[PDB]
Ligand binder design. Structure first.
Ligand code: HEM
Length: 154
């Protein structure tokens, strides 16, 4: 699909707020996902053992992984649709190194939206949430088409 410049602006305006605290946002989102959808935790042989939110909150490995996730996602969004190059190694690692179905991308999309709504209500009204949801669907559909070229679902 295609985002208008107005929509991208709404996306990058909240994101600028997120980047004020990348690790904290990273943590909130991954724990939102693990609680909300515990089966997702199973994909990480690194975190598999964390039993309660308190254990999640205090794992430094998890917080680090959350910076990595948000730094790569931020890089893609800042490309404003021209993210072919950024998408290729992402799709490869999530389709053959480990296999992450599109369903799970939807779940983490939902957690991102959850967290932005909680921490940035004045910058995350309805218009801003629809733009962000548009940006994430575009990511997922492009990733899905890449998955398919690489030999996996999509
Ligand atoms: C916003 C969506 C996502 C982004 C931007 C993202 C990004 C990344 C990046 C940059 C890495 C490390 C570098 C590499 O790929 O080798 C990584 C690793 C990984 N991701 Fe994701 N990912 C996303 C979603 C997910 C989801 C939804 C799951 C599972 C429920 C997942 C599972 C994994 C696993 C299992 C690893 C490797 C674990 C390890 O470090 O040993 N990813 N991800």
């Amino acid at each position: 699909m295609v985002l208008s410049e107005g929509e991208w602006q709404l996306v990058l305006h909240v994101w600028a707020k997120v980047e004020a605290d990348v690790a904290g946002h990273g943590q909130d989102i991954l724990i939102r996902l693990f609680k909300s959808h515990p089966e997702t935790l199973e994909k990480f042989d690194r975190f598999k053992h964390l039993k309660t939110e308190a254990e999640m909150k205090a794992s430094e490995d998890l917080k680090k992984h959350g910076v990595t996730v948000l730094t790569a996602l931020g890089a893609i969004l800042k490309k404003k649709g021209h993210h072919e190059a950024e998408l290729k190694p992402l799709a490869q690692s999530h389709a053959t190194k480990v296999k992450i179905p599109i369903k799970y991308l939807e779940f983490i999309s939902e957690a991102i939206i959850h967290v932005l709504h909680s921490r940035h209500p004045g910058n995350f009204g309805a218009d801003a949430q629809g733009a962000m949801n548009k940006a994430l669907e575009l990511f997922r559909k492009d990733i899905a088409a890449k998955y398919k070229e690489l030999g996996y679902q999509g």
